[PDB]
A paper describes a structure:
The crystal structure of apo EuTPT3 was determined from two crystal forms with space groups P43212 and C2, refined at 3.0 and 3.3 Å resolution, respectively. All dimers observed in the two crystal forms were superimposable with a root-mean-square deviation (RMSD) range of 0.797–0.941 Å over 595–633 aligned Cα atoms. The superimposition parameters suggested that the dimeric architecture of EuTPS3 was highly conserved and unlikely to be caused by crystal packing. In EuTPT3, α6 of one subunit interacted with α5 and α6 of the neighboring subunit to form a four-helix bundle, whereas, in EuFPS1, α4 of one subunit was inserted between α5 and α6 of the neighboring subunit to form a six-helix bundle of α4–α6 at the dimer interface. Thus, EuTPT3 had a larger central tunnel than EuFPS1. Our structural analysis identified a unique, TPT-type dimer conformation, in which the central tunnel connected the active site with the bottom of the molecule. Crystal structure of EuTPT3 showed that the residues Ile164-Ala165 contact with Ile164 and Ile125 of the neighboring subunit in the hydrophobic tunnel, suggesting that smaller side chains such as valine and glycine provide the wider path for the product that may contribute to the activity difference. Furthermore, EuTPT3 conserved a hydrophobic hollow in the bottom region of the dimer interface. These observations suggested that the longer polyisoprene products may pass through the hydrophobic tunnel at the dimer interface.
Prenyltransferases, also known as isoprenyl diphosphate synthases, catalyze the sequential condensation of a basic five-carbon building block (C5), the isopentenyl diphosphate (IPP), to synthesize prenyl precursors of isoprenoid metabolites and isoprene polymers, collectively called polyisoprene. Ultrahigh molecular weight cis-1,4-polyisoprene and trans-1,4-polyisoprene (TPI), which are the principal components of natural rubber and gutta-percha, respectively, are also isoprenoid metabolites that are assumed to be synthesized by specialized prenyltransferases. These prenyltransferases are divided into two major groups, the cis-1,4-prenyltransferases (CPTs) and trans-1,4-prenyltransferases (TPTs), based on the stereochemistry of the double bond formed during IPP condensation. To investigate the molecular properties of the EuTPT proteins, we determined the three-dimensional structures of EuTPT3 and EuFPS1 using X-ray crystallography. Similar to EuFPS1 and other prenyltransferases, the EuTPT3 subunits were composed of 10 core helices (α1-α10) with a deep pocket that included two DDxxD motifs responsible for substrates binding.
Numbering used by the authors:
A (entry chain A): 6 to 66, 69 to 102, 114 to 348
B (entry chain B): 5 to 20, 27 to 102, 114 to 285, 289 to 327, 329 to 346
């Protein structure tokens, strides 16, 4: 319910005393990029820092209080997460010779945004013990995000010509490196490092959180096709947009040459009739049930692995995440 | 001369206790980083040598063995950056994302080495944080160039009109110019204990000097003495976004544009290079070269003469090669 006012705070800090942002007209220029890319509603990820910090602190042990400045710093890390998300997504909406110019514009927008996170961390965490551990954490996620984004770029462009480019290892690598790292690992890891701990003793939680991010994106991908548009509020467009959906990949693995030509001849096309031809081929593969298998299997696998963690509070946080994502329609 | 024995010790500290896949990481390291040339590592040391031989605090002498070591450690960090920047240039339709996935993860392994190098060897210095800023800046500019070059090279397979001067200049600037010319000098400067944000004028010079160097490369790869270079120019065959192609596409506004579209086999490649000749291009190079050299010489002399001596040394080692 609390509205995270911190966004305007950080914008005022960066746009004033910092290192750049001198000319009034450059200050306005930077602000337009900032507000177009970062505070785009949703904000489920950055708060998950706060929910994680709140549950970790409520269940640890003595030293036990609650400061407003603590909430402030946790929310600042949450906004750093939203900045990372913004940089990861800069290249997602493409719509030939006009393409390098468009990419150059987008790249340089995201280039501007990547140079804000270090200033935020320095301004607000220079003096803390865990500052370097935080910078390590963000450099890891930053570089993994960048790797996934570069692979996604190769795939989406090579996906325009010949759909056979979409494969399960490529989809899983993009989903893991581009998305899963910043979305699920980084929030909890931020709450952990701010409590003054070392991530090198939580490698088991990382694999769980990373796989849950892949599960969350496979959840997303499935909903973008079979999810009651009246509940979502919008119609699934992934098939029109020629996206690298979990569904398309699993189809191309299990389909045959007659079904492959059906996918080659229809997928990507704007024609609605063809999108339905695709969705019917998805049903014809009985994919829905394969999804139910993947979901049930992943949930049991994660539940088992989670309950085996020592820190019971971490177990509570991951269980909270899993129970909030499970079989969701939103 | 300086036999840089030390890569063994750097690799040994990093490698060394890791399952038995240690060799796999080691093969990526020595396949990608040590190439022998190492012009991106020695220019670091030579630059520190000139910057150090200028600060006349008492009597100019020789750098301590530990000093040479740390300067060489940064130069090799530079070589790591260079290796990561170039991981994707030997790309070779589909099958591109699988190849790219291998390459990106190779560069990811090497990208996770530079922070460990700096921490092990610069944890205690004042300027350590300035190093992390500098390397993240150059790394991110490098990554930006790689993404634009990627989009551009793919859009270069489809329609030759895609290659344009702003895209070429941005690629040259972000992908190459930062680590090649700025980064060495900036490393030597940060070890001298200086704030890079007081040298923005030198940065503009070095970045343009890197773009100037790549236009030079493009020119030699086409109108050279292969006996002096030791290699035949393939850029026109390889369908690269050459300085020549963009300048051609600006001026070829008729049947000459179609002649170039129906090209890119040496039977055709010779028709291209002859069409390049038709546009007095050699003269445009000499004009661009003389103009940029005088402009850069002016901007440099317009600058701490120590910075000027280093930049002038770079330009005099590059000029008209």
């Amino acid at each position: 319910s609390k509205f995270v006012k911190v966004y305007s705070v950080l914008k005022k800090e960066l746009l004033h005393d910092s290192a750049f942002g001198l000319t009034d007209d450059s200050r306005n220029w930077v602000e337009r990029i900032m507000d177009y890319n970062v505070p785009g509603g949703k904000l489920n990820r950055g708060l998950s820092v706060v929910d994680s910090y709140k549950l970790l602190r409520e269940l640890t042990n003595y030293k036990s209080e609650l400061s407003d400045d603590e909430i402030f710093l946790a929310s600042v890390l949450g906004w750093s997460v939203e900045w990372i998300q913004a940089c990861a997504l800069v290249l997602d909406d493409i719509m030939w010779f006009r393409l390098p110019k468009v990419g150059m514009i987008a790249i340089n927008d995201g280039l501007i945004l990547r140079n804000h996170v270090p200033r935020i961390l320095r301004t607000h965490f220079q003096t803390e013990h865990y500052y370097l551990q935080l910078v390590d954490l963000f450099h890891e996620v930053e570089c993994q995000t960048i790797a996934g984004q570069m692979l996604d770029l190769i795939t989406t462009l090579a996906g325009e010509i010949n759909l056979s480019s979409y494969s399960l290892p490529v989809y899983q690598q993009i989903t893991l490196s581009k998305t899963s790292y910043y979305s699920f690992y980084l929030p909890v890891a931020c709450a952990l490092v701010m409590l003054g701990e070392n991530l090198e003793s939580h490698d088991d939680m990382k694999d769980i959180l990373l796989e849950m991010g892949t599960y969350f994106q496979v959840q997303d991908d499935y909903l973008d096709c079979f999810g009651d548009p009246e509940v979502i509020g919008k119609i699934g467009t992934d098939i029109e947009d020629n996206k690298c959906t979990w569904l398309v990949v699993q189809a191309l693995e299990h389909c045959n040459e007659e079904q492959k030509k059906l996918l080659y001849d229809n997928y990507g096309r704007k024609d609605p009739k063809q999108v339905a031809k695709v969705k019917e081929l998805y049903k014809t593969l009985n994919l829905e049930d394969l999804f139910t298998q993947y979901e049930n299997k992943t949930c049991k696998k994660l539940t088992k692995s989670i309950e085996a963690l020592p820190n019971v509070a971490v177990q509570a946080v991951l269980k909270s995440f899993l129970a909030k994502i499970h079989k969701r329609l939103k």
